[PDB]
Design a binder for this molecule. Sequence first.
Ligand SMILES: *[C@H]1[C@@H](C)[C@H]2[C@@H]([C@H](O)[C@H]3[C@H]4[C@H]([C@H](OC(C)=O)[C@H](OC(C)=O)[C@@]32C)[C@]2(C)[C@H](C[C@@H]3O[C@@H]3[C@@H]2OC(C)=O)C(=O)[C@@H]4O)[C@]2(C)[C@@]1(O)OC(=O)[C@@]2(C)O
Ligand SMILES: Nc1nc2c(ncn2[C@@H]2O[C@H](COP(=O)(O)OP(=O)(O)OP(=O)(O)O)[C@@H](O)[C@H]2O)c(=O)[nH]1
Ligand SMILES: Nc1nc2c(ncn2[C@@H]2O[C@H](COP(=O)(O)OP(=O)(O)O)[C@@H](O)[C@H]2O)c(=O)[nH]1
Ligand SMILES: [Ca+2]
Ligand SMILES: [Mg+2]
Ligand SMILES: [Mg+2]
Lengths: 427, 440
Amino acid sequence: REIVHIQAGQCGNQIGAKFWEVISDEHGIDPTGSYHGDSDLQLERINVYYNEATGNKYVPRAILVDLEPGTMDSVRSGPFGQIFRPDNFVFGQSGAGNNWAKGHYTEGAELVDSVLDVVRKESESCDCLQGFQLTHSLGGGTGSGMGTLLISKIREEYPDRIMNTFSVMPSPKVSDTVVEPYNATLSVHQLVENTDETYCIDNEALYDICFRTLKLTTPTYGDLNHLVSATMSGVTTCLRFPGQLNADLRKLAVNMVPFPRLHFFMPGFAPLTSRGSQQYRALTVPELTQQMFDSKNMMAACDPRHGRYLTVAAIFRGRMSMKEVDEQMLNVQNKNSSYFVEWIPNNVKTAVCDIPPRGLKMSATFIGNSTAIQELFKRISEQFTAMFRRKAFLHWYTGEGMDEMEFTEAESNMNDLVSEYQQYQDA
Amino acid sequence: MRECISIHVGQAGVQIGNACWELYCLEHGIQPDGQMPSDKTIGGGDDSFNTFFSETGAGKHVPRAVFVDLEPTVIDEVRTGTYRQLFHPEQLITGKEDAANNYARGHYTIGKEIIDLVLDRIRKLADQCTGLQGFLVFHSFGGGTGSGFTSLLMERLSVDYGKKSKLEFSIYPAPQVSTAVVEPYNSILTTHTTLEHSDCAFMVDNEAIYDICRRNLDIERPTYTNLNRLISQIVSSITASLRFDGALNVDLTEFQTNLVPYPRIHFPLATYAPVISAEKAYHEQLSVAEITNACFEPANQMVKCDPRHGKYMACCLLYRGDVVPKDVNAAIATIKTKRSIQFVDWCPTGFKVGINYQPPTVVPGGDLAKVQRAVCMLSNTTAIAEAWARLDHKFDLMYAKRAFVHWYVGEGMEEGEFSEAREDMAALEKDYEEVGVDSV
Ligand SMILES: *[C@H]1[C@@H](C)[C@H]2[C@@H]([C@H](O)[C@H]3[C@H]4[C@H]([C@H](OC(C)=O)[C@H](OC(C)=O)[C@@]32C)[C@]2(C)[C@H](C[C@@H]3O[C@@H]3[C@@H]2OC(C)=O)C(=O)[C@@H]4O)[C@]2(C)[C@@]1(O)OC(=O)[C@@]2(C)O
Ligand SMILES: Nc1nc2c(ncn2[C@@H]2O[C@H](COP(=O)(O)OP(=O)(O)OP(=O)(O)O)[C@@H](O)[C@H]2O)c(=O)[nH]1
Ligand SMILES: Nc1nc2c(ncn2[C@@H]2O[C@H](COP(=O)(O)OP(=O)(O)O)[C@@H](O)[C@H]2O)c(=O)[nH]1
Ligand SMILES: [Ca+2]
Ligand SMILES: [Mg+2]
Ligand SMILES: [Mg+2]
């Protein structure tokens, strides 16, 4: 039951590379692609993310995409850079200049068919392809513009497969350019229509976790990405190891998405411990559970108490009491029942995996479909309008053939998305 | 790739070109004969410095540059000077008769006779690029060639290279070193003609540089040599993002995204620090906080104007040398609480920061102290329109009497071109006023 991974642009390829480093370590795959683990539990579902090559090697089913070669050269020379299939590096030279239009309509349009050819080659080697996962940012040009172009094309050629994305939302707190709200709004417009599941990873949240909780005065993008790759490992554990719950992309979607447009998830991770003496402290299941539901552990800068949970997936990792996990999960729901919509009975599902992540004896990853996510889109909308009011910086886009109407339409649909969340928050 | 071609037009453009390329060579360890011992890839490469330097099989690193002047004596000094081996003879182009401080002669009478040759030589450079990014054009506002020929060239470049990016370093006139009464005419004419053909223009007010040399370097009566060495440091700061690589080194094109909110609003204000003599730099460490604070002292600006009485539309900080993000962030925090920094209501207030680790370089026999860290701020402020206002007023005083206009008419120009140019400048001043007004 194969998944095809795609990583687009600078952010996409950098978190993507980190993701493959992390899960390769978990599955016992070294940078050469050789298995050197001591558990058949590691290889039982390794087919989901890896192709088996000659010499008994394991090759990520991963396609690396960018409109400039820079970041992908750094991936190639990175720790696990050698593991990737060289034919799956698809790149241009021009770059996208943080311009959604360039990624979606001009520069990316020239490269997209090359990417689709590689996607097709990978899909053809699948016994039964379940779908796709894309890693990208929404604030740039390539990951945002070309990434959503790719998603549209893939849906056309594979309309009955699941589309999943890890989408990094822009924040003024951690920003490269002022046009990020434009690029993001244009992208959300695409994601609302053409994905089944989207993990909303807010750079604002990643920074605040690094600053407040982890006590890092000056976080780099690399430190932000450690949080993302750890979270990505967690949310895909059910796909990568034997289990009952959300074991594939479609079953997850059926459990998490009560209405097709409302498929934007808040991910969370625990423990998040600052360095010092307490880093060695043993964590209990009650502490894990409380922290995983804590807003300060969420990867989307939204207050869960400002909305209601439609659905929740929780996944615990490591050796621990299944009985204790069940008891604590029930405690959360029963002690905070008003925050879980009563018109979706039993909307919290829990999985437990024996294999813990590197450097932790136990951890917990949170996936919430909360109406509080509307705060995220409201933020982008306000930032969008502040500029669009005066048509500021629009010439970068109109120069690539876009019209103002397309901005108006993107904004309206994102505002519709927000009001749809508010509807069910009040229901 | 992402090659950049520099075009140096007229005396000011050429002489500033000399100072810039000398500095570049010293920054990259390139000798006057073009040899670069540290470059192990002979005859080519795609290193960061290759954006500005091509390479010959014999190991020569050659500026991707063309020098153009309508008289020979300035460029002749390049041909016989220290760095004569640096340039191929075909890169240095001269006529026999200059524009006589007349825009008309630079754009029409004299310029037309050499424009095709210039374009052919530029084409020769372009054809050697594998991914040409665009052009940097150095010129005065006040000269006949700097004004007239530049605008002709910019028009022709838009035709032959489409929307390929074109940046300017433009020398704005000051009475302390100006050489023509009609420089306000030439300034308005070239600004009007070039406006649609330029993506971004860095104005350099000669009076600002003059004042800085007098006050900060204790130079009693600055010469062009004094002015140009300072100007080169500022140009270097701006281009360093293109010529060096580093994890925190933000490309100029990315700053441009923030700096140009509308096509006509493409004139960033540059502020540079530290400008300090060796005598005063001795046993004096200027910290990140100190040089950053100096960016909001208007005395350190490249153009005389007062941002404290205008509104910001962007603020970019380009650091070079011994600088880490921690210290930058602390410095900016302090400034946010103390200075007069008001943004328009339609743009974010965050400062965009780039850091290049290669430290600032100085030319031997120069006036600037060698420092461990420097910064160039690029801001988009409504205040820069002050520079337009002053020039336009000088223009109006003379044009109301049609003083000197017969010189332009005699070379085939019409009064309609003057009024058309002036009207465009009036609209431009109005544009800078409008962007500053609050939203509904
Ligand atoms: C940035 C620096 C903050 C990164 C560092 C290591 O790779 C990261 C280790 C990670 C650290 O977590 C802390 C400080 O509480 C931190 O990563 C963060 C803060 O995001 C480090 C030092 C460790 C210690 C992890 C083991 C264990 O899981 C605990 C913690 O990670 C978590 C989940 O909090 C590691 O051992 C990590 O190696 C770097 C190199 C950094 O310097 O730049 C990076 O790219 C980095 C994140 O890899
Ligand atoms: N900063 C600086 N300004 C200069 C320099 N040379 C000339 N200028 C200024 O440029 C203006 C005159 O234009 P020039 O460049 O000398 O004239 P040109 O471009 O050669 O045009 P023509 O001689 O009329 O054909 C005056 O305002 C001068 O102060 C220089 O080397 N450095
Ligand atoms: N977490 C994270 N965010 C990034 C990284 N690089 C860029 N971003 C964010 O992504 C946006 C810029 O998009 P980017 O991927 O660089 O542009 P692209 O290459 O054209 O897709 C901004 O909102 C950045 O804050 C990264 O390494 N990590
Ligand atoms: Ca070389
Ligand atoms: Mg980027
Ligand atoms: Mg001259």
